Amino acid sequence: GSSGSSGMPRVKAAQAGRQSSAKRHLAEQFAVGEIITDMAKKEWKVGLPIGQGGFGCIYLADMNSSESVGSDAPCVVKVEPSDNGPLFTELKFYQRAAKPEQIQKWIRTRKLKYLGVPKYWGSGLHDKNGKSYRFMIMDRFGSDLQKIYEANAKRFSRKTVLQLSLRILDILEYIHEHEYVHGDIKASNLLLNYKNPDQVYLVDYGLAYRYCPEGVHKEYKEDPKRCHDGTIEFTSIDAHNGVAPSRRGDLEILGYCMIQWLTGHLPWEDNLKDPKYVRDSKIRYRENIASLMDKCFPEKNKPGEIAKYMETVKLLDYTEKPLYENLRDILLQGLKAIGSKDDGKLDLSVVENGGLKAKTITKKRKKEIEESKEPGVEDTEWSNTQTEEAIQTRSRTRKRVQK
């Protein structure tokens, strides 16, 4: 009766190859071959990772129960050894804003034909040794803009920044309508599609600003705690101190982003190891667009595209409206000056010739630590003793006179 697939016989697997392999690098959490279950509704096969750092456990997931995943999985999954916060922020915002049902409808309503929201498919869980592991699957996602930063010569280009800037602007407009701001636009928050290398998305949202607080009547606060958005990676001076809702900050990050990439690091976001100057330069530069633009960019009347954008962000306060539609035109109009065009390119190709990157980068990394002894339990004697009495001996003498 029924049959698997439409009907594609095997016949042959390799014409000029013969390796297959299997043993490369085992694991205890998420290895290559094991299957993972979603919210009790799916079962994706875990393949191999695509870059580790300090998040959790990124691995490729496929909707098949076959042997060996390899490069047959156009999806990524991030796992964490028990947690309830970070992933909760991305998951919530994902199902709410990254919902293929909402995005498809929204993008179709405005014909954005792009949007800056990742594609969410579902989430899963895995219990091991009594520990509950929570993970989430994503569309694709490949490398981050940080990797492209070096590919640009330690400094982005006027075309790239301007082009990428517009792509990000459309994102800030979406998250705003979803009650989400301060996504944190950086080279460590922006990533390019893996299965489709050409577009970029902005991660981190739920861990930023969900449009005003939850239970607060007073607008002013003046306390860097209610927000605590990031540390100092191009974050608004006010948003960092939890002063008034965050809205214009999204534009501030983009404004400084150009000078940071175009100029390559600045006296504030150099290392972030000394916020002392980072704060002073931020307040000064914020009101020195001309002083910074001249000190960061040439003085031969070359700039202008950014200046206009920075100006709007400097006056963006007595206009009420975010003025997003205008800002987009500022960075979009300049594209004509550089003989550029708004079609659908990010210029983030960074050498797309080949189809097989690896390079020598396979060393023995760490994982966990287990000692032979542990001061958790061994012997708990009794030092103190509670006993209210005055009898024990079977004699009891009698002396003196109680009077």
351: left (phi over 0), alpha (psi -120 to 50) or beta: left
Asked if 139 and 193 count as a contact pair (C-beta separation under 8 A), the reply is yes
Q: Is 58 annotated as a binding residue?
A: yes
Q: Is 230 annotated as a binding residue?
A: no
Q: Is 57 annotated as a binding residue?
A: yes
Asked if 267 and 277 count as a contact pair (C-beta separation under 8 A), the reply is yes
Q: Is 103 annotated as a binding residue?
A: no
In Å, how far from its chain's centre is CA 9? 42
Tell me how crowded residue 278 is: count the other CB atoms within 10 A of its CB: 19
Active-site residue, selected from the candidate residues 184, 204, 229, 250: 184
User: Is 184 tagged catalytic?
Assistant: yes
SS3 content of the chain, % helix, strand, coil (to 5): 30, 10, 60
In whole angstroms, give the CA distance from residue 150 to residue 201: 19
Residue 306 burial (CB < 10 Å; 0-12/13-18/19+)? buried
User: Nearest 5°: phi and psi at 79?
Assistant: -115, 150
Q: Is 54 annotated as a binding residue?
A: yes
In whole angstroms, give the CA distance from residue 377 to residue 148: 51
Q: Is 355 annotated as a binding residue?
A: no
Beta bridge partners of 124: 38, 135
Q: Is 249 annotated as a binding residue?
A: no
Q: Is 23 annotated as a binding residue?
A: no
Q: Is 52 annotated as a binding residue?
A: yes
Q: How far is CA 26 from CA 11, 29, 48, 78, 274, in A?
A: 31, 10, 10, 18, 41
Asked if 87 and 136 count as a contact pair (C-beta separation under 8 A), the reply is yes
Q: Is 56 annotated as a binding residue?
A: yes
Tell me how crowded residue 149 is: count the other CB atoms within 10 A of its CB: 21
Closest among 224, 199, 183 to 90, alpha carbons compared:
183
Binding-site residue numbers for ATP are 50-58, 78
Binding residues: 50-58, 78
Active-site residues: which are they? 184
